[PDB]
Amino acid sequence: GQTVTK
Amino acid sequence: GQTVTK
Amino acid sequence: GQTVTK
Amino acid sequence: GQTVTK
Amino acid sequence: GQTVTK
Amino acid sequence: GQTVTK
Amino acid sequence: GQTVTK
Amino acid sequence: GQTVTK
Amino acid sequence: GQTVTK
Amino acid sequence: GQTVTK
Amino acid sequence: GQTVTK
Amino acid sequence: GQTVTK
Amino acid sequence: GQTVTK
Amino acid sequence: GQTVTK
Amino acid sequence: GQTVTK
Amino acid sequence: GQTVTK
């Protein structure tokens, strides 16, 4: 998958 | 999947 | 799936 | 699915 | 499905 | 389905 | 279905 | 609000 | 709000 | 908010 | 917020 | 926030 | 935030 | 933040 | 997968 | 932050 967390 | 969390 | 959380 | 939460 | 919550 | 909640 | 709640 | 869609 | 979609 | 999508 | 997508 | 995607 | 993607 | 991706 | 955490 | 990717 593709994940960005901020 | 594709996930962005802010 | 595709998910954006803010 | 497609989900946006704000 | 498609969901937007605000 | 399609859902928008505000 | 299609649902909008405000 | 409170919403359930099925 | 509170939302469940299925 | 609180959101569950399925 | 709190979000679960499936 | 708290997010789980599956 | 807290994020789990699968 | 805390992130787990699988 | 692809993951960015900030 | 804390990150695990698999």
Added chain:
Amino acid sequence: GQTVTK
């Protein structure tokens, strides 16, 4: 995988 943590 590809991972960037900041």
Added chain:
Amino acid sequence: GQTVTK
């Protein structure tokens, strides 16, 4: 930070 990639 703390990172594990597999």
